[PDB]
Amino acid sequence: APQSITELCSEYHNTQIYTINDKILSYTESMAGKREMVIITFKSGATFQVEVPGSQHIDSQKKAIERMKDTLRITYLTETKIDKLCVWNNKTPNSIAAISMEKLYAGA
Amino acid sequence: APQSITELCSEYHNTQIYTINDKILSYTESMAGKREMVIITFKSGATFQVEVPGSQHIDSQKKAIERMKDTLRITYLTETKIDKLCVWNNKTPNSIAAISMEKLY
Amino acid sequence: APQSITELCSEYHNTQIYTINDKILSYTESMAGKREMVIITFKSGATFQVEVPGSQHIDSQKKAIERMKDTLRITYLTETKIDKLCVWNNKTPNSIAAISMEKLY
Amino acid sequence: APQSITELCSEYHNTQIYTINDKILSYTESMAGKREMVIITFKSGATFQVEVPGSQHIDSQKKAIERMKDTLRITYLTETKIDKLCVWNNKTPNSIAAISMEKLYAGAV
Amino acid sequence: APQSITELCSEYHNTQIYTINDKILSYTESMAGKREMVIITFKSGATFQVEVPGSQHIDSQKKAIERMKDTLRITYLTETKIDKLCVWNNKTPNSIAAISMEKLY
């Protein structure tokens, strides 16, 4: 198993690491039919989504998607700084594949 | 996929964006049979609901409804400011379709 | 759909609105067989419960009950002030049907 | 339905109320096979568990067990004071059956 | 039932207790197909994971895994200090089997 979000992104096609290093500016959540998704944007202008569950996803991904949306909401509400985002750039807005957060009052 | 709550609202009939720009005044939650819903109101007088799961909803719009209700509760409790609300105006009170929040911290 | 907890309570028999206007004094949760419930009390002496899921509950209520119990726990932990409680008075202690929370902010 | 954790504990065999009146000292959670449980201890030395789901538990107890573990974790994290604990003393460590939490009150006893 | 994380770790093969005594430095969560996992690292350089649900895992382990990932996220967000970690060292990075947290105030 990968030990980094970067290492993890390297295993997929059409993924790309975006160094956010900032907290979420806006959180949008929809329960509208066929558009059950979450959209987050940063002051950098960057906009991402946790795309509507469908055929692009496998079964094990069902819970992961819900968890990802749970994470984005709590991250937004607690004003937690997001470090990097591994996203699929072949989707508009870019679909989130993985998220990493780092509390840096130290190093590594 | 839409990149905005406004853009998302544009894809539906009977929807309408309400610029709330305020925190939830009251949170009401019911578990009473046939009225399992959540009602939120703002000091503006505006009142909205996350309607009882019915036949008007598609299969896995089921999880989204629960999540919407989870979001409204945590938003209320944390006194988080809600920006906009895409709602279906063909329901009384207006049913929530999407919610957007932005912290200009 | 009702726009108020009071309006909602009016639709049911054996319900009654109780103006709590106070935070939860005690939170009791049981996972003991046949008594999987939650009991909350206020300094007013008032005691309420989210009764054990049974034959009087339709399947739409199943998630609502769990949500109600989730709400009471987080309300208690965050010391959030509860406004009103629509409860079924034909149960001892009174069973919670709906809860409303307001804020003078 | 009982109106108290004490009244509730009275309905069961092998149960016993412990007046903790303190916050959780340690929270231990395991996902190891056959030992999916939670263990909490207090500075009093008292140690309790939310035992691994099995035969002794029924089917509505399934969600209640998960909820109990959810409650212990949030209680621990928020440093919330636990009042009493109705536990089954026929298990080691004692298995948690119910938990009660009181929130101050200058009105007094 | 064991009464300690260390006593619990002793019941398994390929497990090992790591005394972390520190808060999580980084939290990584993936929903990418076949890599639905969580990775946490500490300033000590130590890196652990809650491995992708597979075959080693029985069935009641399904909820435990989700719970473990829920715990790591909330622990990270609240900057809570983790005491010990019982992990399976036969995986890279080491897979988390159990976690213990203490206060000592």
Swiss-Prot record, chains B, C, E:
Keywords: Disulfide bond, Enterotoxin, Signal, Toxin, Virulence
The keyword Signal is assigned to this record: yes
GO molecular function: toxin activity
S-S bridge residues: 9-86
Any single GO CC term annotated in Swiss-Prot or TrEMBL for this entry: extracellular region
Effect on the protein of changing residue 13 to R: In strain: Isolate 240-3
The protein's role, per its UniProt record: The biological activity of the toxin is produced by the A chain, which activates intracellular adenyl cyclase.
Subunit structure: Heterohexamer of one A chain and of five B chains.
Name of the featured protein: Heat-labile enterotoxin B chain
Species this chain originates from: Escherichia coli
Lineage: Bacteria, Pseudomonadati, Pseudomonadota, Gammaproteobacteria, Enterobacterales
Full-sequence portion shown in this chain: 22 to 123 of 124
